[PDB]
Amino acid sequence: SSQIRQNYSTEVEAAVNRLVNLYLRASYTYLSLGFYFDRDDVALEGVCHFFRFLAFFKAFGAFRLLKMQNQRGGRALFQDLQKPSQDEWGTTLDAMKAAIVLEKSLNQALLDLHALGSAQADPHLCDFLESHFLDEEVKLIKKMGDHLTNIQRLVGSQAGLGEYLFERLTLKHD
Amino acid sequence: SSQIRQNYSTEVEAAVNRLVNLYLRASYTYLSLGFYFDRDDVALEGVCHFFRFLAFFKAFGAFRLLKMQNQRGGRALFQDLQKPSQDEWGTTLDAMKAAIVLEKSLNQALLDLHALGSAQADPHLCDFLESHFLDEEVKLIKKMGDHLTNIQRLVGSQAGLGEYLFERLTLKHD
Amino acid sequence: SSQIRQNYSTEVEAAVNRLVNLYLRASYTYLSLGFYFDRDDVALEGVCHFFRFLAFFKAFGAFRLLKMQNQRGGRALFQDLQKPSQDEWGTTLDAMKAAIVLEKSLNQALLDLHALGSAQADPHLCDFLESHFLDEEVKLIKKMGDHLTNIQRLVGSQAGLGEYLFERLTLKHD
Amino acid sequence: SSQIRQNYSTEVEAAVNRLVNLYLRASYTYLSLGFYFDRDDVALEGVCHFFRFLAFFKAFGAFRLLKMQNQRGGRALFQDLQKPSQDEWGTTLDAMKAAIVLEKSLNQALLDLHALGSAQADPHLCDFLESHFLDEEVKLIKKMGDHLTNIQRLVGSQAGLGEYLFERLTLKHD
Amino acid sequence: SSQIRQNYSTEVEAAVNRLVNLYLRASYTYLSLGFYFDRDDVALEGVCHFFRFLAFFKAFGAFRLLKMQNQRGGRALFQDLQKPSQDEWGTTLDAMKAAIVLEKSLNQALLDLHALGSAQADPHLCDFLESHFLDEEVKLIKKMGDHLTNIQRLVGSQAGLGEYLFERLTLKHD
Amino acid sequence: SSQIRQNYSTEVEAAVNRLVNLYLRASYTYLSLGFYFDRDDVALEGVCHFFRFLAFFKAFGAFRLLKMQNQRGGRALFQDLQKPSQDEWGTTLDAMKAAIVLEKSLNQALLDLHALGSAQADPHLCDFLESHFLDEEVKLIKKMGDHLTNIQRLVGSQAGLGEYLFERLTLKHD
Ligand SMILES: [Cl-]
Ligand SMILES: [Cl-]
Ligand SMILES: [Cl-]
Ligand SMILES: [Cl-]
Ligand SMILES: [Cl-]
Ligand SMILES: [Cl-]
């Protein structure tokens, strides 16, 4: 079969392809979230920019996984990409909750693939995830949790005021 | 008649003169809105600056239309410029609603003139509007809609606080 | 009434609004003169540029008056802007004569408002006109008189030659 | 409904959403083509880079369409993204033929949407496609046709030699 | 037939080839006008330079049309280029009148090809002409009309003096 | 007749006009060759660029001849420009052979005009050709001969491979 493949199981190869799909689905979800916040009747630029950046970031993750698949002699296989779970995303709070849920699911998938790699004595795979994904993911979830907490603190009798202030004073815009 | 005029109908020539009037009326309306927000008892600099800029922008549009009238061999004809519809403009929300109404009317006038040009097989006219007015107008209306949405989100028990915060954190001032 | 208004009569406030109208009418007249000289069958760029600049200059004068109205606690009130006195402006000589007539009328209006301010013991108003309008106006009328004299000297059996040479050698173009 | 929507038909809105799907599907197809050419048993870097760039370019096209949908007051709706038509793409020639087929299909979709816009008297839509998509698409198809011709000229008894030389001397690598 | 041709009619292809011929004929006419004004017994450098530049400009137009023909998959076909209508071009006025006549004929040909493109639902063709030819042509005809008017104003008892002054003070030389 | 003409025969004047025609015909032939090699089904950029440059170079030669005609007091006379000998130009080899044939014909025409000048004791004419045309022409024919030899060496069982390699490694492209 492959002239380069070594210590690279069919199980890991398949799970890498599945993880690419999950990252591209996440990218697609973030594209939808970003354009929702760009609507004239939502109009929260800082939220749009936050999710738009994550769409690019998740696509980059898929690209890195696909590059690694080839470096190890595996074969990239693509599947249909499921549309995002929602067409409208509600409030900034609703969206940030959905994002944390998505990220925890991606994180569990990274942890599951790491555990498979460990079980299969594939240290290149384990290091790859540890070096390029696990800490990036922990840092992103921490940031979303921080944001969630600030959004929640700003919700009261005055939800619109809080939603505006969060977008203007925490999120990057211009 | 003209040594240069070619494929330039009397109907388009007249409609161009009418459109100049509409743009200058819009400029005048924006001058009034700007100075209203500069009043010591209104005092919203960011709103003043927003409308003052649009007054200049609409005058520029009229200048471009008049330059084109001459480039095509038509004759600029000016009519009286009607005073703005109001002497006092209410809240930022009231003003931004009035501006969107004005812009939609200008947009319909651009679309009507484009349709006349198309019907008269005048592609220079059509391209002129498409290249210098149609997208500029769509972009401006999108921005006003975004602003309207943010102003509306900030209205509640605390309308003054919201009006101040919008002017300070969304609109350009200094 | 106003939290800032002091020593600012209703008569001066009204006369300031009237003077804004006169300056905007003058701006409009200069816009018409400029585009007339831009016609393919007139084609005197230096004359077009001269009047176009005056259109901007007169609008600036109206802006300064409106800013002052607000600084004093008065209320800007806009009226319809009458179309210019002519649709076609004749020769450079005819146009420059019309401009001097317009400027003398604006000057008389400045002098009349100054006299009202003096009579009402409003030195801020008097100084405002003296510092930003009276000398600017005298300088502009002197320049137009100089131009008129040169245009007249160039009129003879060869009026077209003189009109061309004045536009090329006295007026700014490029 | 929308505070900004004007002259924007439901038919165009739906067709824009469909066109976004087509552009994202094209991006996905190009991602697959690129990683196929990055395989250790294919190893044609210049071809990988060509298709990888087109994946980014087609995603950019979808982003521009989605931005426009919002600028016009329409609502972005996403659908499932179908996996590419092939898992393996054959030779450079096979791939370049598949790309031209894909591009002609995207081009027909642009032309169809332009015709709908024209029929609906939507000049903003027509100009948008003309200014940002029609010529870009014609230029890309011309380049692929040029490439196809050069690949074909290099096919003979020595197909591998030709495939290597095309990748090294025509396509960008490093 | 062509691997790239799409939505490109035989009628448009033929009309593009005809238009190339017209632009090259115009270039040739301008070459002749330029060298006539370079004669020692004509000696009007500014007029020579004006027409020489237009010869280059019209050739550039033909080059752009030929590039587009290829981008669309059509086939460039060249025909004999007819010599200019005159061997001697008379006065600057005679020449500028001939140039405006030539330009109006080229403009009508552009408008005719645009109308054919519109009728054939070929928006790439329509946009190409609108973006690279229609406004350039309107601007050039406006300039020639301006020149004609100035030349005419300078004709009187003293035609030679006027012809010299126009060449020295309006046209670019050095 | 001419105030400047001296030692400039009617025979040389006529032959100069004929030579201008030949150079412009050559320019036209090179324009056709260049656009043929730009076809999507030919696609040899380096060959297109080679012939496109020669089209410009031959037009420059005609311009220099026309400038000289005027410097000597002769009168430029233009004739119809015959279309190129072919609509399709075959292979790079076929085209380069046609170009050498064209250049040898231009060279013979230069030599014939030089011999006429010598016979008529017109040393300005002789020097003009020697200084600006004879060596340029010898250098160009040497380059085409070098190219012909390299194209011929690359023709064998693998003509397409050779044609590609010549265009990529000898001719300038980018
Ligand atoms: Cl499937
Ligand atoms: Cl009236
Ligand atoms: Cl009224
Ligand atoms: Cl679904
Ligand atoms: Cl023939
Ligand atoms: Cl003939």
Author numbering:
A (entry chain A), B (entry chain A), C (entry chain A), D (entry chain A), E (entry chain A), F (entry chain A): 1 to 174
Please give sentences taken from the publication describing this entry:
As a scaffold for aromatic cluster design, we chose ferritin as a protein cage platform with a 12 nm outer diameter and an 8 nm inner cavity, composed of 24 subunits. To prove this concept through protein engineering, we focused on a two‐fold symmetric inter‐subunit interface of a recombinant horse spleen apo‐L ferritin (Fr) as a target region for mutagenesis. Herein, we present the construction of an aromatic cluster with an artificial molecular binding pocket at the two‐fold symmetric interface of ferritin and explore its ligand‐binding characteristics. We developed a system that uses ligand binding as a driving force to induce and propagate changes in the orientation of multiple aromatic side chains.
To modulate the shape of the central pocket, we prepared Fr‐F5/59A (Fr‐E53F/E56F/E57F/R59A/E60F/E63F) and Fr‐F5/59L (Fr‐E53F/E56F/E57F/R59L/E60F/E63F) in which residue 59 was replaced with Ala or Leu (lower). In the case of Fr‐F5/59A, the replacement of Phe59 with alanine (Ala) results in an expanded pocket size. Conversely, in Fr‐F5/59L, the introduction of leucine (Leu) imposes steric hindrance, effectively obstructing the pocket's entrance. These variances in pocket morphology among the variants are anticipated to impact ligand binding affinity and specificity. Replacing Phe59 with Ala or Leu significantly reduced the incorporation amount of NR (1.4 molecules for Fr‐F5/59A and 0.4 molecules for Fr‐F5/59L). Although there was sufficient space for NR in the A59 pocket (distance between A59–A59' 7.9 Å), the substitution of F59 with A59 excluded π–π stacking interactions at the site. As a result, NR has poor affinity to bind at this site in Fr‐F5/59A.
